[model samples]
Target: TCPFYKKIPGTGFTVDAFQYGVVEGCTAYFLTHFHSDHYAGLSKHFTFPVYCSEITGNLLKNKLHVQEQYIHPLPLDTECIVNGVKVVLLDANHCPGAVMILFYLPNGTVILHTGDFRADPSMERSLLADQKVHMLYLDTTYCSPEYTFPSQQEVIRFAINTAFEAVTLNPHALVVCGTYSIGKEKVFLAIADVLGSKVGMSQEKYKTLQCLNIPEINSLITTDMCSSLVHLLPMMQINFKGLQSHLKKCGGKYNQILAFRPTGWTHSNKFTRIADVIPQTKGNISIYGIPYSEHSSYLEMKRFVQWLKPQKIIPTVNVGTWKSRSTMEKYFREWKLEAGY
Candidate 1:
């Protein structure tokens, strides 16, 4: 994936390209979601007009300490013109406040920027399915041909089913589950509901999560460190040292470091028969590798182009090196050909 993305071709707007720094002709900056990767350079000192969703705007203000004046929060499924370019925001179905942006320039050439999305049935039959897209800025994080992920609900069901069995045995165990904002909440939200356990996170993050309309989640989240076994943390913090820090904070009420990490990088060509989930246990801690990803699978990516049939595919990920570079483009060529374009 390209963290060093440039300004959109022929347009003055930059989507999730803040780290690349200032450009002369750049008109506006777009934040796809609250994910740190998209809004890296966004701070109080950085004064640039930012266009994003309402929830995204809330997080930016509270979490990043960014000023309200610089943030231009747009409602979903609505039209807006920023810097004189007509734009529409669609639900990305990737994470909370995530969106797939559509830009219509003066010449009627529709440019779709899929800012890190997962394709589902809703998007397949949407109005833009058949719209003529001249150039599509894609989010091909899982561009491997073999990356056919299971549905989100199915993965959630399997995780809930798996965690309950283990947690039932040890009632007082530190139920460390989920990583980061917006994306993996479904996994651990299910955990708190089924297992009858509350959740623990920081005061700021808990306040930030209030932006969501999930009323059920409001009861689950608490700042009390010892109140809940489910300690929400980032992916990197779910490891040994991270778990150790929580262990000290919680006063060792936990007999086991039972945590689940939701990630997409576990499987490959070797595990074609990826039937059930498994856990990696070292002594006391059991870390389950949940194959829950926010990005589109390879098959899903193919289906996306099949529906839109863009005139040209401008890949936004894995384009720097020989080994990974242009691998996604190979499939794009065949798919475009099959689409009769």
Candidate 2:
């Protein structure tokens, strides 16, 4: 199984805390974001120093109740020294406080831990020039050619426009959108701005956003689900059971409902490239799946690996039993050929 924690060879630093048992031995910890998966065991009782972006630090201190002294703020593109190891944070473009960590060991080895980042040219140009990368830890969540999706902006545009059209078609129907607590704020905000409607979110979701202190979305949130035409719910809450439970509580308040699930898993085929919209209708609800992913597709991952030219690639998530080092190397070699890189 993937331990979800990577240890540096010479340095005692570890990246991303998924399990509590691994947190004790590390001299320091670097958090990529506030996602529960990335911050599995983090709490007010954390003992070691934690390094993350300013927004992430705030969320950690306020939401997770992590102690102030243990939380260190890491600004984007800024280099700092922690425990004699040179460290830098780069924008991951995945979420507000998400970052890609760069570590420079005392032995002159450079290692990069891409903590759930999408493709950003600025990050590539700034970090990959002239320096040799010894090891690369990748977030291969969508490491398949079939996972190609459009840019986030395009996906948001399609989602907002399609959602409005769905509502127009069914006057009594309300639009339900799926999103995570921290990520996908752009999609929801754009939907409200363009459609001229407010987003209704649960109290926990609104509190999560409020912790970020971002001015752009401060005034666009509400707890009243019936106050607006669009209701924003956590991605995990958009499933059949959850939605059915919610609909039952409505007690025939409306005749129909429309839903949009923005994700890269809209189709399980090889030809899913660029941005495309897929629509499905079941019972009283019309659903649309929009391709929006925060991770790189296989083609993008292959291109990134080729461009960075790392000496070795380490898959972060244990896809299938955490293949041996030799097996990973062989997989990469074949993956490059299959991706046509």
Candidate 3:
């Protein structure tokens, strides 16, 4: 749906609304994650006070070049008071800097705004499990019954096994995976760790990963492209010719290239039981489309609603028109009723 999150009714805080300019009472601006769709309105000229996870804050500074004075990177899973209101940040398990925000308002109204998150099993162990929440602003990117791809661990295992199988066939084949500015890190890291290989990417991508603060990935990334068989590039450029240029650039170290274009698009059902899906290949290159989504699946979203059972639910996406909002509202009510609300 729509990523444009208008101001919450009473919070005086804006979540991922940099494009909308100033709201009348917005004293604090929050960014859920670093995706372009979520941060469309952000820029140097914007003077709004913004808040996000420290990793996202580093990205805002390092990647988006946002001013240091305006960016507020909060500590994760810790309670902090902002403008006399209690606030806590929980890892969203989506990307490097994504977080689920909890605000204990002045009037005892607890609001849990899941910026953009995957509903992992650990959600039950977090502080959120015990506390009762009043309102939940949810990430409704895949709220329907038809968008479940696979689990995070399952997809990465598939990626590892797939890359491993390629190496088994072509020992000198360079494994390449396309990625965005700051997601799908685990997929390649899985391949590299299990295969005892390093990772190669452009210097720009390297700098962004530097801010990610993940130590295992930090040790695995290298400057010398030829030193590692695993390389990363943009998802759009993972075709035959795209990988061919890199194969020659690696100075014949790799006989061929195996590329992965990871995304959330592949679906058998809302709850897809991942099975044998083939890859596309050319003369010297093979491209595999892996289900590596940062967004929650339909079941994940439903489970989050069922677990929390917040008194009120608000959607953060797919609500542009009145009709779309109505459709989303129905899902909310249906999921809400399942929670015994």
Candidate 4:
């Protein structure tokens, strides 16, 4: 590794003078959020320090609680020098703690990396107003025109409506659904808010709600408080057999109960036993379509790239490269101008 020259592939900067390795130059790695994909590599190895905004650091140190290696935490908009390189952390307007990173170079090249960001008006105003971007790199996970999803409020409405329909038919039934550890919590809370029902037992999710101080978002009775009401599990994993058995055990009405799972299962080959059994076991069960997603839709992605007007956009993440290219093409045909190797 000593002879290896570490380079920012696009910038072609040399780092040999900064460290022992041939290209061991200074790089201020700005971690955007607490997602495993963004911060996983740093946990097992790395002798140097990594920088991030205060909340990002909290998620890393307090939430994920990575190995007690050196992690240099900085407040938002704080400018600091690491290995002779200037770095700053700014709000990415994604989940809490996510920050768009700015790496300033002596050569006057400013590169911005947007990690899992959203185009929320308030967030965009903060990012677009404070500074000018020379090169902007965004998270183009769902940049394809085909990737359309409903808004958060819409998803909540659908889930709530479905719950009400089920309860109308079976006043004695319990409902179940599952969502991602971070986001679906809010969706279920929305369901509870609209239906005037309490959220039910989910030990792991309950613990996260407590830890993140998001208990206010929940109005449903948790498993710990199950004695007061009918218990429902918001799990994407409950199979038809389990749903039926759980209802029977609870002395609930099968037709009145509802257990739904919102899935991106449409695009993939992966199939769970639960999805297969759901249709068979509960004929009256409702399939509420709550198609809310965190990533930007196809239209949003197009507008964003058109706004920055980068000299050249090099799409990384091998899986997303093709889709990113396709999206940019919708705005400007024959994108030979922004092609990357």
Per-candidate Cα lDDT values, in order, are 0.78, 0.75, 0.81, 0.54
**List of clashing residue pairs for candidate 1:** none
Model 1: per-residue Cα lDDT over 23-94, one tens digit each = 577778888988887777778776888899888888888778789999999887767877788888899988
Q: Estimate each model's TM-score.
A: 0.90, 0.86, 0.92, 0.69
Clash counts for all predictions:
0, 0, 3, 12
* Lowest-sum lDDT 10-residue window in model 4: 268-277
RMSD of 2: 3.3
Instruction: State candidate 3's TM-score.
Output: 0.92
> Candidate 2 residues 1-341, lDDT tens each?
22644776787677875475654457888889888888988889887888999999989988889999999897777678888788888888888899888889888899989988886666668855748888889887766555666677777777777767766776677778888657777777777776678788888877788877678675687887777767887678776667776777667776766777776565543555434545565677666666667777667777778777677777876455545444556758885565554
Off by over 4 Å in 1: 1-5, 178-182, 211-213, 240-245, 272-275
TM-score of 2: 0.86
- lDDT ranking from best candidate downward: 3, 1, 2, 4
Off by over 4 Å in 4: 1-29, 41-48, 53-59, 67-96, 213-236, 245-255, 264-281, 318-341
- Report RMSD for candidate 4: 6.8
Better of 2 and 4 by lDDT: 2
**Best TM-score among the predictions, by candidate number:** 3
10 residues in a row with least lDDT, candidate 1: 267-276
Off by over 4 Å in 2: 1-5, 18-25, 169-171, 239-254, 266-278, 319-328, 334-341
What digit string (tens of lDDT, one per residue) describes model 3 on residues 88-169?
9999988888998888878878988888888877887998976899988888888787675867788887888888987988
